[PDB]
Design a protein around this ligand. Structure first.
Ligand SMILES: OC[C@H]1O[C@@H](O[C@H]2[C@H](O)[C@@H](O)[C@H](O)O[C@@H]2CO)[C@H](O)[C@@H](O)[C@@H]1O
Ligand SMILES: OC[C@H]1O[C@@H](O)[C@H](O)[C@@H](O)[C@@H]1O
Ligand SMILES: OC[C@H]1O[C@@H](O)[C@H](O)[C@@H](O)[C@@H]1O
Ligand SMILES: OC[C@H]1O[C@@H](O)[C@H](O)[C@@H](O)[C@@H]1O
Ligand SMILES: OC[C@H]1O[C@@H](O)[C@H](O)[C@@H](O)[C@@H]1O
Ligand SMILES: [Mg+2]
Ligand SMILES: [Mg+2]
Lengths: 724, 724
């Protein structure tokens, strides 16, 4: 409907109606739910909610099905005075019912189209089950794998994170201006504004502190890129940002988000984060938390009651302008309008059961493709991999038969529909002998059974891994290791004198040095999702050729954290010309290098890259154009990730030794050759100075072209002269 | 001499003389050195230094003896045109020849007078060997025991560090206006400005980042306190501060240090730090490093040549004002004048050999007293300790006989003057059997020998520890554990049936859970210094009663780092009520609490504290006066450390759960009772706000009185009304 009618609605609502529009509730607090109706009464009472509240609530959080949605919406519109439909929001993080790989695995794909397709299928299915908004992409930069939520990020690089972030937004939303017509797309919500991934000591919800310059330089850019590509909502972070909880941080949300980034959509709290500013000790009570959060421009309170119970009194007493509430209500209403909810409140479902669009075989193939794009081949000594189809496999360990391969933040996907490792392998390999072990134990009886199975077979597939519940939200591990029983199992298996492949399933970087030394090959599958065992079978047999690269550094040990590729030089860098010396930046007990670096991954093919002659000089404001020829010099069809890095050698701020500024994944048949070009615009040469200006300074830059952050050729370009 | 004559001198110097005055060199680059003369000609060449340079250099670093000094000063004054004497500077960190405990141990004393005495004795001896300046106190706040330089800090609390920092300046300098008269006192140099202790991942020289507010709130206060108490010099830090190397950070050094803090003394670079701005990538070359470091107000270049080779040309070319040079030279000259070098360049030594004053028996008793004040008794189950003097001791471990007990940053003390644990013990206990083992091994032969000795005796003194070389500068450990062989050794000894005391020697917090659990008692000696063996024997026999408290948290494990008492609450604090719940700030694998907390330590006595009745309310600006009656309710004389903490319950910045604001160590005979009174000024109630103002806000505070950060009574005060 036309904008004047939306504004008219704000004009016609009562103050109590306006307040309640700023509240989000679980489905079972609404009349007409068709699930968990036993939780409805006790919880209404603890929250002190009444019908006057629920019958005017703005939004639903986490409906269970299309019928829950229809029931709740139909009943709500029977009783709602002005006919304002509810908006339905959910966590579709790496898939709906067809579960794709966890986001950290998707980072390892270095492939933008993989990420868009995952988001498109996610929306196809989520809208088919009645959802209007997804709380995705999660764009928190991560340098600390203790933190369980690393699995929701694309990793340690702001540029990769920005690019894949835009790809998710595009896949979820398509053309943002036609969400009222394209009802298989949905609104995306960028989360968590801001810098939540820097949680101190990897502890959930813990303190974050960094300088404003670093916040601009590294932590904000991906939120910004997704916002600029049209993301419809943003969600606040649980953490403090320079001492003030993000949720009531007026500088952050008013000046930066709404001012500098020009975000004019719904800002929704993280769960309870409005109330939690009290725990943080920056509001005395719910009246203060209400007041400050609305001043900061939080439009929608997720599952707490500060707004419903306190805004009236604040507005009446004059502590808070009613104008701030009207503008919140206007953003809520515009979102609903943008989704077409005033013409069709059932968003395509009322006369059209789209059950047929859920968990299709086409979708399952897309998920499998994504899994084979995302896996990272870490070791492969002796061309152990790929295995011949008639290889006799002893499949052993906790991930041999475990159905827990769908990953964390899988709110709607079902283990029964997933493919485990044994099942996947038996579709490909005629001879498999299996010994399941538990995640945290290694008994004598296990060792006897493993030993018998390995004696019978030719090669061991050792399937190790985390339970998903050891990561995700509030899954912080102080020591980023697997249970010790699993390292003991790898130690045991090695003694049996057969070639060993370790297939590792997990949601964070781990300490894998002992796994690498104990095996001939090591394949990092992360959690691939619904098609996990096929992903595994195809990569091990060579039907698919591994092509993923690490999007997060794998530490030598927990105590090396944080370690990351885009680090500062220091005043005393370790060099090959001084290694051995005492008075340089090093540790007495480990290398400075991570065990495996950013951008690293192996292949069954072999590539050779050649970069075209580059200029020696460049004007300010000018783009560098980088042309690269890649050839597959082996007999095996394969994909490689060409990566381009920049360094600013001398600047007014000590700048990182490398930053990624371009990537493309190139597919090549045996012997095929291709040329690709990259434009590094002058923004690729720019940075935030100590004054917080985005600047370009004349001087020397190095340009690194290669297939990891370590396997690069290097070139020099002197930037100077005039601008443009 | 008079100020006019100092100024006159600046006038009379040539440019080349002014430039060289800003250079500091090792003694063997000067004519007249009586040690390492073979190093002179080659290094003069590598540094491209001439006579015109060395004959006008401003300062000497690390002279080796009184005779090195005299010889160098005689020869230098022979050729120096205007007669400007050299100033001699040295690292007297925790003792000269009489070595005291390491600073982190002196932190655990909680005893201002212990710290002043150490510094007084340090100056007495250092001046006797011809030194004018010491590079102490080191006031870097530390939260990361991976960093080897934690040993040089007094720990994790800015208030303790501030207070103890003032005590050290007072002991070194006494009356700062009378350094030309008091020739047994010496100039103090505060180091390292600023925030060096926040090195990321505990890696030496590494990146430091934090918000400016945090910098003001926690990282700056100790440097400021020492500067306000009259410290004569300041030394720059190796790290970046907000992306700019401290050494050339003009905001840091001109605006904060000289401006806000009103420091008008010599600013000396850390070693090589002027040149190392090149490595950091904030200067292209030595000409830029020179200009930038001089713009920042660095007066004295430690052992690099940027100034010496580049200032002339920068000044002649108009890219640097000569007025900045003249400012630096005048500060150098004024420091010399403050030390009385213009009337007596040998600072009391020339006709007065003070050899007699070095390593006296009186000085040794003061170092032993500092040792018994500084040790911390961590465990003592079933009153194993004190031991009766007729107790039969099996003394075993790497620290049984090791002479390595003087600590890191012991530049002048000698192990041959030190008392080892065996020697110490044998002066007290008639029956000791000794089985030394190596630091990093445990052989079958060791175990047989250990088994025989423990069978013969009644109690085990298990002496465990670090080599001092595993810490100090560029001694970063990624995992804060002793070698595994030591933990094995503790496990083995526990099986032998006999009671075990572990005496631990070290320079950092370590993972000690496994030691606590394998022994009946645990005494943290750190590195007591020269008298270490007598320190250990007196505490174990109870001739001295343990009275130290932890000044730095002992983590549960490496991955808990950083953990510290003055932490923020977060939005989801783990409470006694919600423990076990998934969605709160916690780890899956360890407790939140460190293994031992700030302010914790045991005693052979038992104490009772009670706090006199406090006001419910306070005006803004008003001091809170806290009165505490402590009784010793045991038969054993001892000392308790009374600690007072404040918390700001609600604020415009999320504030820490506690901050230490007062402390006093009280000595009490059996049965004795005392009253101590504390004034918490309105400054104790103040903090830095998001706009970087020092403010006091109205509202609730909690006041905690007790004997650790955990063992406290709590009281509430509402601050409001008008301002005093
Ligand atoms: O230099 C950092 C480091 O200082 C060491 O001091 C040296 C000193 O520099 C040298 O001139 C003298 O001969 O010996 C000492 C070694 O005893 C100190 O020993 C280290 O602990 C500290 O980390
Ligand atoms: O479940 C809805 C939301 O709850 C928040 O608190 C979580 O941290 C988000 O990641 C999630 O999108
Ligand atoms: O109350 C804790 C709630 O917090 C949210 O952050 C979680 O994502 C929900 O699982 C949970 O119910
Ligand atoms: O509650 C927050 C959590 O959402 C759950 O429903 C998911 O299964 C978890 O993996 C995630 O960490
Ligand atoms: O690296 C050269 C010098 O650096 C200083 O910081 C160290 O303390 C010296 O021990 C060392 O010789
Ligand atoms: Mg540059
Ligand atoms: Mg307050």
């Amino acid at each position: 409907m036309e904008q004047e009618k939306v504004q008219e609605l704000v004009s016609q609502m009562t103050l109590d109606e306006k307040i309640a529009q700023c509240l989000q509730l679980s489905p079972f607090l609404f009349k007409g739910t068709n699930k968990n109706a036993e939780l409805t009464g006790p919880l209404l009472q603890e929250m002190k909610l009444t019908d006057a509240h629920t019958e005017n609530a703005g939004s639903v959080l986490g409906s269970s099905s299309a019928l829950d949605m229809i029931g709740i919406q139909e009943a709500y519109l029977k009783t709602n005075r002005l006919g304002i439909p509810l908006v339905f929001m959910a966590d579709v993080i790496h898939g709906y019912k067809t579960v794709f790989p966890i986001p950290l695995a998707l980072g390892c794909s270095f492939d933008r189209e993989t990420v868009r397709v995952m988001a498109e299928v996610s929306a196809l299915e989520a809208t088919a089950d009645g959802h209007h908004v997804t709380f995705s992409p999660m764009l928190d930069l991560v340098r600390d794998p203790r933190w369980g939520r690393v699995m929701e990020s694309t990793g340690e690089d702001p540029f990769l994170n920005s690019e894949l972030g835009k790809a998710m937004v595009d896949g979820y939303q398509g053309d943002a201006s036609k969400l009222n017509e394209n009802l298989e797309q949905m609104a995306a919500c960028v989360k968590h504004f801001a810098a939540y991934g820097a949680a101190e000591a990897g502890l959930e919800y813990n303190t974050v502190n960094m300088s404003t310059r670093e916040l601009y330089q590294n932590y904000l850019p991906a939120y910004n890129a997704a916002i600029q590509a049209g993301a419809k909502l943003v969600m606040t972070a649980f953490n403090v940002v320079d001492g003030i909880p993000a949720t009531m941080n007026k500088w952050l949300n008013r000046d930066v988000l709404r001012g500098e980034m020009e975000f004019d959509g719904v800002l929704i709290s993280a769960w309870g984060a409005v109330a939690e500013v009290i725990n943080h000790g920056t509001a005395r009570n719910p009246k203060e938390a209400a007041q400050f959060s609305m001043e900061a421009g939080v439009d929608l309170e997720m599952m707490t009651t500060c707004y419903i119970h306190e805004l009236k009194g604040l507005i009446e007493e004059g502590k808070l302008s009613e104008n701030l509430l009207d503008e919140a209500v206007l953003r809520m209403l515009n979102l609903k309008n943008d989704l077409g909810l005033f013409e069709d409140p059932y968003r395509g479902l009322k006369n059209n059961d789209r059950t047929k669009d859920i968990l299709t075989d086409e979708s399952r193939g897309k998920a499998r493709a994504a899994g084979v794009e995302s896996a990272v081949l870490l070791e492969n000594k002796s061309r152990l991999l790929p295995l011949a189809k008639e290889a006799k496999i002893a499949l052993v360990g906790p991930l041999a038969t475990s159905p827990d391969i769908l990953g964390g933040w899988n709110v709607y996907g079902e283990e029964k529909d997933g493919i485990n490792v044994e099942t996947g392998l038996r579709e490909v390999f005629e001879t498999v002998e299996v010994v399941s072990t538990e995640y945290t134990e290694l008994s004598e009886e296990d060792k006897v059974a493993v030993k018998a199975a390995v004696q019978n077979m030719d090669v061991v597939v050792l399937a190790l891994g985390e339970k998903n519940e050891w990561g995700g939200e509030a899954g912080s591990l102080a020591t980023i290791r697997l249970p010790e029983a699993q390292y003991q199992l790898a130690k045991f298996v090695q003694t049996l004198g057969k070639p060993v492949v370790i297939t590792l399933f997990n949601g964070r970087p781990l300490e894998v040095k002992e796994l690498a030394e104990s095996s001939d090959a090591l394949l990092e599958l992360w959690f691939p999702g619904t098609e996990a065992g096929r992903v595994t079978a195809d990569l091990l047999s060579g039907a698919s050729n591994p092509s993923g690269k690490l999007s997060m550094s794998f530490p030598q040990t927990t105590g090396q954290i944080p370690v990351y590729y885009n680090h500062l030089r220091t005043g005393r860098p370790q060099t090959p010309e001084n290694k051995g010396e005492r008075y340089v930046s090093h540790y007495l007990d480990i290398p400075n290098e991570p065990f495996y670096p950013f951008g690293y991954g192996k292949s069954y093919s072999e590539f050779e890259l050649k970069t075209s002659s580059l200029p020696k000089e460049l004007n300010l404001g000018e783009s560098l154009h980088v042309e690269v020829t890649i050839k597959n010099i082996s007999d095996i069809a394969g994909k490689e990730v060409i990566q381009v890095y920049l360094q600013d050698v001398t600047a007014s701020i000590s700048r990182p030794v490398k930053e990624l500024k371009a990537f493309e994944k190139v597919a090549l048949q045996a012997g095929e050759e291709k040329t690709v070009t990259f434009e590094l615009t002058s923004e690729a040469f720019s940075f935030y100075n100590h004054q917080l200006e985005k600047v370009q300074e004349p001087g020397l830059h190095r340009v690194f072209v290669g297939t990891s952050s370590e396997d690069v050729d290097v070139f020099e370009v002197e930037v100077g002269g005039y601008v443009l």
